[PDB]
Amino acid sequence: GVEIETISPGDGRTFPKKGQTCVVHYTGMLQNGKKFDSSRDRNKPFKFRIGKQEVIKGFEEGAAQMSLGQRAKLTCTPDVAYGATGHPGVIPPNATLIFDVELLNLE
Amino acid sequence: LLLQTNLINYVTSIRPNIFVGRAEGSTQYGKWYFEVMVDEVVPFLTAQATHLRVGWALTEGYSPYPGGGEGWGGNGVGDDLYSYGFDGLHLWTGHVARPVTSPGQHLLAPEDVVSCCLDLSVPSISFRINGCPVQGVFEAFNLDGLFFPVVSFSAGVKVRFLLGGRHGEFKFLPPPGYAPCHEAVLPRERLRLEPIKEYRREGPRPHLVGPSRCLSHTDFVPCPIVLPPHLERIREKLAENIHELWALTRIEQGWTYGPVRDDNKRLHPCLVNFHSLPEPERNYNLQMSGETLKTLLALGCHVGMADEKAEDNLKKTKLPKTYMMSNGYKPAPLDLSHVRLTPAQTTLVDRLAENGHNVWARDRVAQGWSYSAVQDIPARRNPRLVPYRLLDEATKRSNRDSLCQAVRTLLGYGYNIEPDRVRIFRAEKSYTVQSGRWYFEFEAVTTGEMRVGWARPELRPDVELGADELAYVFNGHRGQRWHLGSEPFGRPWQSGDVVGCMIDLTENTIIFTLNGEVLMSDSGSETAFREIEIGDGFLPVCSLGPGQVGHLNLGQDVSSLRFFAICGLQEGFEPFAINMQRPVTTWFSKSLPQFEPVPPEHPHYEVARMDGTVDTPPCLRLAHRTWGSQNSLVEMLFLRLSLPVQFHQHFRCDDPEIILNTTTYYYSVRVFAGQEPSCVWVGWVTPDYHQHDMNFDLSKVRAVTVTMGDEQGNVHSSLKCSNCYMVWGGDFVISHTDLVIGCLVDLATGLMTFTANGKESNTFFQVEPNTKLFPAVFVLPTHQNVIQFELGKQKNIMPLSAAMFLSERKNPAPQCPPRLEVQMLMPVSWSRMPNHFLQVETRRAGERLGWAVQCQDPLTMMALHIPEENRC
């Protein structure tokens, strides 16, 4: 169960399904107020497509509900993204992850 | 545990001069409101979020600086407890984010208007945007200061403020009772957009300033017997001569005789004399005379009755043919041509006008009237209800020369009458010198409190600069020595002086120059001091007081020096910037008070840790050795242990089996005997604490009530954001036995009820989960050994060492490491300005749009967290 709160109003026209590449210009920040991930530091948009089991399942269902120009706020519980131990050196075990996302282009 | 970093933004803040505050008898109304319209803001120019929000704060604690602070970095409004920031999704007040339940929520996009409404007696901070107010307010805060508008803007923001109705026109009409902001203006100050706590401005050739002195909260309020028988009838004769001086300039400009009184018709009922005046008009001059003779001996002016022949020999003034009107009657005032203006009483009648009319402001405010730049008789508005040194000079002599027709008249009657802090501007200690010869200058466009000279890199900003053996500085407002005393040398300044200092450290000569001319002493020597040891070398220092302008002349290019080609260019001296690839960054002291660790070799206070026994655990206490004579100045210390405890995140909503699962940890203090328990304040303080005054207590602490709800008016939850969750040691209290005040923190639910001597008290408080609290006491000691923290635990509660770190959470052995020692706030530290700032500029086109603020400089900066104290 993931709670979604929009930030800026977008289109409401195109939300993705299977067979669609997507770009998300995402930022990451944990619950204690620390930075861990971004694509601002890259000057690259992150490119992936849904249904390839690429992103974790707490993100793959929240990335299929938004539209163009839409900035959202998704608070992922630790049960839906690396519950037991997780990635070593990135996230401590059972900590909530909060992403403020923005879809750039390409449906 | 360790130190991480990321790129962070720059913020500054602009502020107009609308100062609104209250007291018991205040000049306010209580209702003021404004808007800001947003049209030109970049979405994302930088890496992180564009820090963009509005808010209002009070002048005593809120001070945004681009270098340093708390948090991650980039602190504007909403980042402290004094300000109330809101960007569109979360009401920021003290490093928090609270969700707001409004239909169609978004951030400050262009082509929208953002505002907040504020009222004064009962606290209410509501916010207004997009035609419907959001459902979130603040109340129950402390207003010990005045209000101001202030905005937060990152790189790439161009916004204008909707000022009022005079220089603006509001798109949204206010609700009935809410007055616009455009008329809380001081009369001799034009409405100016100046940044808060500025220390630098862009000039013709970057000049630096000091702190502008804020108007005090005890300044706007108006604050103010026997009858001598020898001045009773002459107090009515002075009122009659006041009616004569009333009629004398009246008949010469157009006041005519008439049975009625009218403003446009110029009809006077009191144009004949004082004897033809009616009864409500005669007692008016009588009550004015009664109000003004009672304040003679209220100051100490000795008045005596003598020379009874001179007042009787003094006749009236001569009357011309055109000085008398078309009525046939003439006033006869006393000619004061034999009276002289005295400079002694000219300084007293300047104060008696305020003594006579701040009770006028008293009496208009007690009837319930307010202050505005417009007057309005149904709204009881006037630009009159001002203190006298806040009043403009258009009223000064129109009041004083109207009342000065009585004081030289009583002279001719025969009655004789008898009569924040300072900043230090200095370079870094790695740019110092030990051999050679160097020179700087200082241009002083404002004659004020300047300190120019050189100092040592082991500079202590605790001591005032000039009184210790670490600086050899120049006075010029009085013009003398400042090193281990004061003795005269030199000349006063002029507005636009160039003064510098050079040192021949080959033979320790100190040379001050004034506009090319070198000054000599009372002995005849142009040099100031000799026999100086080099040691650690010298440092270019400067210091500027409250509210003046003056910059440091470096001298990078030789042609930028003006007064070095006259003196000192031939004998061998050179400017400081001989081979410079970049401008120097000179550090400067901040009036932001924060914490600094305890030196072991301190001559006032000492601390020490005990050993570990079974009956008493290993703990620490404080001791004072220089309690007795030889100038023992003791003041309220603010002890703290430098490590926090962060709580559980989402709440739950002896035998070893019951201690392992619960999260509650208790500590205490025990004040020793013979000390005042009334000034002992025990509890926990968050990092949002940047204040220091000499007699703080729990009446002078701020807490902001946050609550949000639905659109119909119902409440959902209530939240208290405070910084001082402590109690009073004298709440339950030459006592012979020591007393115990404890604090327990239950981490799972967050409720903190404090216990005293094994029995519980009444006061409870709750905090937001993702904040931290430092263990701290505020105690004035009244003997030597007073404060004793205890690292102990009773039979069912674990100590603080379990909640300290991760590696020891379930072992009940209480020991204290030397990592945790005491922490004391000293009111001065050192921060750094960057070599490139935000070149801000103000513009307006049109009469109803509003003055716009611009920026165009993209700038980011590498800043750290140090998460064991949370200070950027």
Which key phrases capture this entry?
part of a larger assembly, 2 chains, A: 107 residues, mainly beta, two-stranded antiparallel ribbon, 1 helix, B: 872 residues, eight-stranded antiparallel beta sheet, FKBP-type_PPIase (chain A), cytoplasm (chain A)
Number of helices of chain B: 6
- Terminal Cα separation of chain B, in Å? 15 Å
H and E string of chain A: EEEEEHEE
Radius of gyration of chain A: 14 Å
Number of strands of chain B: 49
Q: What is the percentage of strand-forming residues of chain B?
A: 25-35%
β-strand amount of chain A: 25-35%
Catalytic activity (chain A): [protein]-peptidylproline (omega=180) = [protein]-peptidylproline (omega=0)
Keywords (chain A): Cytoplasm, Isomerase, Rotamase, Sarcoplasmic reticulum
Pfam families (chain A): FKBP_C (PF00254)
EC number (chain A): 5.2.1.8
Ordered list of secondary-structure elements with their pairings:
The structure is cut from a larger assembly and holds chains A (107 residues) and B (872 residues).
Chain A: E1 3-8, E2 21-24, E3 27-30, E4 35-38, E5 46-49, H1 57-60, E6 71-76, E7 97-102
Antiparallel strand pairs in A: 1-6, 2-5, 3-4, 3-7, 6-7
Chain B: E1 5-8, E2 31-33, E3 35-41, E4 53-58, E5 85-86, E6 91-92, E7 112-119, E8 124-129, E9 132-133, E10 136-139, E11 147-152, E12 157-162, H1 233-251, E13 256-257, E14 267-268, H2 279-293, E15 303-305, H3 308-313, H4 349-366, E16 370-371, E17 381-382, H5 396-412, E18 415-417, E19 423-426, E20 439-444, E21 450-455, E22 471-474, E23 481-482, E24 497-504, E25 509-514, E26 517-518, E27 539-544, E28 551-553, E29 587-590, E30 594-597, E31 605-609, E32 620-624, E33 637-640, E34 645-646, H6 656-659, E35 664-671, E36 680-685, E37 703-709, E38 715-722, E39 724-728, E40 739-746, E41 751-756, E42 759-766, E43 772-779, E44 788-790, E45 823-826, E46 829-831, E47 841-843, E48 852-854, E49 861-864
Parallel strand pairs in B: 13-14, 16-17
Antiparallel strand pairs in B: 1-49, 2-7, 3-7, 3-12, 4-11, 5-6, 7-8, 8-9, 10-37, 12-48, 15-18, 19-27, 19-29, 20-24, 20-28, 21-22, 21-27, 22-23, 24-25, 25-26, 29-46, 30-45, 31-32, 32-44, 33-43, 34-43, 35-40, 35-44, 36-39, 36-43, 37-38, 41-42, 47-48
Helix pairs in contact in B: 1-2, 1-5
PDB class: membrane protein
Keywords: Rabbit, Ryanodine receptor1, CHL., membrane protein
Entry title: Structure of RyR1 (Ca2+/CHL)
